[PDB]
């Protein structure tokens, strides 16, 4: 809420109009009061100025003494139930009237050295009242700046109704007497007009039926009266108080006796911790979803219902207490020697020349209230859906992967659930795998960790990989090439998962287009060799000194938000110092997963 | 809310019972958690102890490691929506079990130097499990205090139902299937019993009618089943949100669709500023009175309804905004020369030998928003109702008194009202008068001020009076005598106004009795001369040095609260140094009003 | 200093104009910087937006990446040497361009569901560039709101120079080469024009002489070149540092080598304690007056000089140290029994029936550093100048009054001086006298104190007077009547001292007129009996219960400030309960002086 005043600075004791009016931003203010008036730096006792409690407009009280000088007014008001106070927000300069005998001077007794228009109370028909500021003195007297109030009246054939359309309802059992009255403007005998004000009126028993629809002062068709169907006013609008535990689905339905036609609903001052957690539907019922993040506590919720007949607000109390199944994480850790395990993704390498069946990870930790063993487990294979399969032991959480190809990474989503029925709580997390190999030219490309956890706002760089014993770093070249896949984890719905491909619209096609409309399915947006003249333009790239993957800042996003998900692409290498774009099948690997999350 | 734990200090690893349980005062606690466990001054990682989230009772987790030493448990819980946490509230000493071969020792290999009973898990039928604390050592080894758990079982013809009476409802359209089940204990074929537990049960279609009403294990008449009328559960219980201005009457009615039989209502966590301002009736409707003191602001109000079928809480929002008629005082001031006028009662002296018609006070000040002239005025004569009359000019507030006798004080209540209709605001205040005179022996007794504003808790003394020119202070004596009157101003209803009189029960008779059951209508409770051996016993008295009225502390009250009101009594004098009890008619005056208010 | 931004909310990556510009109040801002950019609630690394350090206007950097979303810019700048910073003061919504094939769609491949004008870069000749907001989608794709930038060019015979007048100087010894150049617009051969821009130019040796004074694109007389006399630029502008003691006169002259024609001067950031204490004259020299209130301390002073050739600021240091003669008060006290004496005016009563020569007060106290005896003394009679005389002993300060009439008050101004010569310090204070008497009907009217020290902003009331032994208060009436005098003490110069009189303009005539233009020299503005229907309108009045003088709030002032001075008027009385306006000569007294000071 913000507020300031505009209006007349200089006035005299005869001022009867509004002196100063507020302009505000935020909630419509009300209960205005003048809390202090000062005159020339000292308190002013008498109630010289008044303020309209509803509008905040300031006028002069006509019975008050009006000594000359600068007045400062302090003003208080409310907006959305809160009190605000402003010291010396309005300044009013009260001037001395000019001497008695000045017309629109009595026997040349008073001289004037300065003439200025003070105000006139684009031309309009009607009377203009002009006021002047004059500097005057009697013979031999010191000059004085005064105000010449209401000095001159200037009076200058006749119509707009705001609005010009209006509704009247057909009478019936629910409204046997209906009427109409328009605002004051600036074949049937049932519509009348007040001759002085021009207000249009209709009394009860007009006999107007639903669907049925010129003033002389001739202004033809200056108003339109529409007869319409009765709109039922809002009644019996309310919700029961609600008591439940954390993270469960709750339907909060309005009472079934609700009456009211064509109603709209909105929250009034929804508490901060409920914002985004409660959804109001078009019928005014509220949904809270399973897995919601409302903290334990007690909350007051208000809903306003509105139709053309008026508004009504209802209040209920929502109390959330502890769910005995509530928990927030589990961990499998890693077989890469990396600790603390919580500083790295859950990730497992199958050694070069090894077997997938030798690596079957079991979870190791959780904050589940009834302990690790109390959890039940599900798994969903994410990558590579064309050849990789995943299963899980429902009671232990042991994961088995089959089909993952040497030289590639895979990814699954694991869901742990505590409890059963309506109060069950589930936590879902990714687990990643890398099937290492010795590929062409004795290369054994290994990033440790092979999951690069990156903040898409800040960007960053991965660990430098090991290349394999005997590999000459100096002549090694490494670049993304093809076969890009993206899996949304907890990003916006518009971050569509899947492979970058011709004629498929998904997050990767959107990302590619953000780099260049012509990028198609090429390596360009992720390539060092295609961006050497300006690397800052790439979505990401591998450097040719250390072979880290670099992710550039703020690019991994769309209009709906930052990426929250994981990307994998095929990378190719060359061992003779050349751009590896044409590397043959045995020199192609997918050794690293990029996991974007602004929490990293 | 307060809480502490009692239970077993010393345990061993085989402990399966409740170790420690809470005793609490205040709101029933819930959502218990153990937030920390320490062992021997260091953090203990594993979840060795568990706490029941509902009861707060503490047990040992059987799969946990149990190293030896003193454990300290920190506990959190909620009470009435607030979280409380207690560091090291529970201490558990985990002991080492005694060595293997001790029976209820294996080849005299282990010696025992100390025997103590640890616990037994007034005698009762059933099995007692005994545990011991023993100090033991193998030959040549250092002695050790251990625990001997479940060492001995001691097993010692058969019934109480709590409660012993229970209700079942007759079936009908609103409840076509009704049942019954009793708690587990410690002619018809429709009542059955579980042979193992002894629970009494009745299935639907029992055919029992309203009004209609022995177990072998023979316990005759050990349970009574009463058939009763269906109690409608609470439904559609709610209130609309309420918006109004300060100090006006408001009826807050529950929605007319309410269902529910035999219901009781109470406020839940009523906000501090509404306490005493909202009244809940036996139907659950709420009244707010005209002149209520609820501050401007927005309030959340909750009401709980309860019957035998359960409880339901409803919430509404109450918003109070500024009343344009709101104000808190007016003042008439005084004609005694006393300032600031707000430090004294509104009070007017008619001079000795003067006329009542010469003193017609008009009000001088107010905080009325539209100014002094905007007020309308009413008056009510309080004293002396046997001879004094009061009128007021409705628009100016000018008071006219007639009939007040020379030598006496009078009192009126003046009511000023701002505005009209439902939003009108009224303020009621006393105004006092003293008709001075020269009485017998040239005495002109004048207290200035003649209204003694006293705090009845603290007590105090009046101003010293002027006696009149020529009066010898040394030989003057002055004492309350008779004709005592009391007028409740804003005290409890039980402070009944009126004259102290035989066979009339009012505040003065109660006050008299508090001094002495035999005081009747005598001067004694207010007399110096009747209390000279212990003045602290008097309700009040006049001293014979300065002639101040003294009011003793904490006496002017009854069981319902401190006096808030005004007292006048006849005082008599003597000019020859004697007890003035028998002063003749011309030496009797009522020159001072005592106004009691704990705000003074 | 205050600031906010206006401009374009929605942009695209092709935006090359100003996006947002500041509006400010206070000192012209400079050294603008963008201190932070966020995108969608996270830091944005790259320098996407730029800000002009001088103007604060914001543009898009064309080489930057431009991801889609809402950007928030934090801005810092300086104003008058101080740094200000504003978090998220500017918001910029970067949109996605609309798809490739949209003209001003490629084979109906993209549908549009919404058309809006984004911006057009009252009609004017020249090219308008239109941009659109469109909602679009390819067949089967989710719709997207995009921006269609530079979509349409609309191109719509020819002149204003701001300003239209300009000065060139005649050449001479001090400026042998002078030129002219006008701003770009929106008989002699020495004035030329750039054909493309229309700038008017004159090279050196134009031969134009002092006093001497049409473009085709024909705009006749569209510019006026005035030949004028050389204005000497400011040079050698400075002041010496200044060291002196408190309260002495100081002339601070600029160095005598100053050069510069037609110069104006102002202070730059004058320290608070020097404001009102240093006066800058039209030559740029500074005066500090004897009796100035500059505290001891060291001050930096800056003065800016400006003419048409530019500005130059000079700085000096002013150091004020202790004056050994510095002091602030003396006191004579009073002979009225009133203490502490500093809570009352210095004031002396000559008893009824007494002699002026019996009351010759001597001063009693001072904070003079060398003690009371070190002071020398002067006196000036203020009232009554028509009959009263005052002398003083120069070394003791003993005052002698002669000529003051029974029944009246007098007033003198006493000046005490410590030290001699340039470092002497003087303090001037009033001392008042009351020559009491028993006047008609045994009245002995005495106010104690008889100097009513009143704050003219707050108003107030005097002490109640004693009327004399035997005087009946009930029938006494007292009112100001005539012979009003006012003496300015330390008020504005416009508070002219002297008697209220016909055809004399002074503070009292001004005060009288403020009450009513018709008041003349009547009692009305100071009368109880002339204002009984609305006492709040009086300048002051005596009440008829206690006979206190009342001064109404905020009235004793004019446009230049509150009264600081003393007023005396003749008051008349009646002993028979009547308006005393016609009291004869023996019932007329001037018993009270009103001393106005906002320090009271
Ligand atoms: Na409700
Ligand atoms: Na499990
Ligand atoms: Na409700
Ligand atoms: Na009135
Ligand atoms: Na200098
Ligand atoms: Na001296």
From TrEMBL, chains A, B, C:
* Database matches in Pfam families: SGBP_BT4661-like (PF16319)
Q: Which residues form a coiled coil?
A: none
Q: Which UniProt keywords apply?
A: Signal
Key word Cytoplasm present in the record? no
UniProt protein name:
DUF4958 domain-containing protein
Q: Which organism is it from?
A: Bacteroides thetaiotaomicron (strain ATCC 29148 / DSM 2079 / JCM 5827 / CCUG 10774 / NCTC 10582 / VPI-5482 / E50)
